[PDB]
Design a protein around this ligand. Structure first.
Ligand SMILES: CC(=O)c1ccc(O)c(O)c1
Ligand SMILES: CC(=O)c1ccc(O)c(O)c1
Ligand SMILES: Nc1nc2ccccc2[nH]1
Lengths: 185, 188
């Protein structure tokens, strides 16, 4: 991931004018859409939190949790840490990232800081539901000037995606001012 | 460097009791002694700064600055970013690291933060002198509990090192209180 950390702008886009900041959300949403497509309910929830983080949930199968035979770590960790530009870019440029996977009757959790896992992916409980959730806090060392998520930039792109991905429900929620939308074709 | 960032304790040692913290200085000092040994004058200066950073400088040839054919970056950057334990561990576990190389009449400067170079190695000026200087700020995200450099730990070790490295002048300076030492054994 140091190649991404060296030149963030080349992977995510301009880190000063707000282009890169919002692309972080869109990269995560692309992965959530693929997961939503192969599930049953087919819904995604993008939430802007009051502390300037964004969470993207899907209700799909849950991304794979088993150990990757080559890398020797969880398959999820390989997705989050190894080089669509990839969510590993988003992880590398996030001062914190929380991963939650609901799969095969179990809830799995992992925390990253600047792309570095704080511990191995771990089973934290039981559940009937399935899906994946990523909440990330953009690194304020990387992202300058425009540091706050504008609602309408996200709403605009998610609207475009809802037409292209006709089977998927996309909800957008802003916890700062209570604004919300529901894009579905 | 992510392998070091994943488990800092495995590379630098205990990051709570202060032993790992001081190992950061001694790893850089071992590289400075290697560079000093290649010259004739051979002086090293270790300085504890008032902001709890430590600088280590030598007056040797200066570490290589040319672009590495495979890696596509300066040889200096390769040394600082590719995995004693190596300086790349020190760089990875420093919230800031400043590199200054004087070589072939040119001053070269580069800044790192948490192992990540902020720009490519750059010729910023001219010089009659040669040598390498590394100044690092230990990462407070990694190093907990004991976060300040004890003068006595460094002074004791540098004194021991002086007797193994003949002709190498080792100066220790503490800018917090003005305390300084000069270890120079000229045996053989
Ligand atoms: C990282 C990843 O693969 C991913 C998949 C689904 C998600 O809902 C998400 O937020 C991230
Ligand atoms: C890391 C390295 O090669 C190095 C060489 C000389 C030095 O004086 C120093 O502080 C570091
Ligand atoms: N603050 C901060 N920035 C970092 C960049 C890479 C790895 C760890 C880091 N901690």
């Amino acid at each position: 991931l140091d190649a991404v950390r060296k030149r963030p702008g080349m992977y995510i886009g301009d880190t000063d004018d707000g282009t890169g900041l919002h692309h972080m959300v869109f990269e995560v949403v692309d992965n959530a859409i693929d997961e939503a497509l192969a599930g049953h309910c087919k819904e995604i929830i993008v939430t802007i939190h009051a502390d300037n983080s964004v969470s993207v949930q899907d209700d799909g199968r849950g991304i794979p949790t088993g150990i990757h035979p080559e890398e020797g770590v969880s398959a999820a960790e390989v997705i989050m840490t190894v080089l669509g530009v990839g969510v590993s870019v988003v992880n590398a440029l996030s001062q914190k990232l929380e991963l939650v996977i609901q799969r095969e009757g179990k809830i799995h959790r992992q925390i990253y800081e600047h792309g570095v896992p704080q511990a191995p992916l771990a089973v934290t409980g039981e559940t009937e539901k399935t899906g994946t959730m990523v909440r990330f806090w953009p690194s304020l060392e990387t992202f300058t000037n425009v540091t706050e998520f504008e609602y309408e930039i996200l709403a605009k792109r998610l609207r475009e995606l809802s037409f292209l991905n006709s089977g998927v429900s996309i909800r957008l929620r802003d916890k700062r001012d209570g604004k919300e939308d529901h894009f579905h074709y």
